Design a binder for these strands. Sequence first.
DNA 1: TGCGACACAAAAAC
DNA 2: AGTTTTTGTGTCGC
Length: 290
Amino acid sequence: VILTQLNEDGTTSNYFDKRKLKIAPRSTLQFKVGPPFELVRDYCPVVESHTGRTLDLRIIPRIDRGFDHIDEEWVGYKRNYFTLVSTFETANCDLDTFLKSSFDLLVGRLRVQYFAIKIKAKNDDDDTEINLVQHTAKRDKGPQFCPSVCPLVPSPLPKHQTIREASNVRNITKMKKYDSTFYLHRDHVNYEEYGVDSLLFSYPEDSIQKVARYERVQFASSISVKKPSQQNKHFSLHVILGAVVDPDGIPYDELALKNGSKGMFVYLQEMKTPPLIIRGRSPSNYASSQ
DNA sequence: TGCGACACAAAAAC
DNA sequence: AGTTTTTGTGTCGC
């Protein structure tokens, strides 16, 4: 009834079928590592402004809630939350040096203002985009919002246990404990060590995330989870790393900038999950029906 | 047909 | 140790 896999950090992922077993909402058994991501492709090259060195990049993503590995399929539930976290790494650049440097996109052409992640959901069979929604912990008693683009600096991805522990922290002392894991506070650095053109100082806000954490995420309530043949639709979650550049023939989205202008989120790399099955609200998807 | 809205309840958080 | 918070899901109805 429960299949157990050991995670990288020594925690377990316990996969079970909610059609057969009902577990409490806050049980640690609800936390588990989801399907592994794979490279879709690399897009625009990035180089350091003076040396011309190509910046090697790698997205480091993981799902920590919402998906079970059941009989060779990865299964989620329309009504339930998933958690998707990601960082990125720069193999050839240590963080301290990276933040003092400046980078251009090779279309030295366009100056990178900052790096950022976005997530998307798609129908894996035809590439149609599917809307995602997020809630706050207050759920129906708070606002609903779409996942946003997250400015980020390179960092190792926290272990599954750390994401679990930081999922519902309110206590100030505890939050202080995790602060350095999740944020870089630009306002606390020695400004004299940085040039005006440094990458750190073109980030849009002083509080800069080290990890993109998308919690309390759901597929849009109106998604159809079966095909007309009654077969299950296959979905996929995508993570895209981009460089945000000033608007003033390569893949990019438009971004409602901070200068109040129309920025450009230029794609650098994209990863995706294998096909995912999403179970709808039908009573037959729940153990209660048995 | 299935969904928005409200309800219940169980373990985490403090 | 007791109270509040969070979230899977049961249920009513439009």
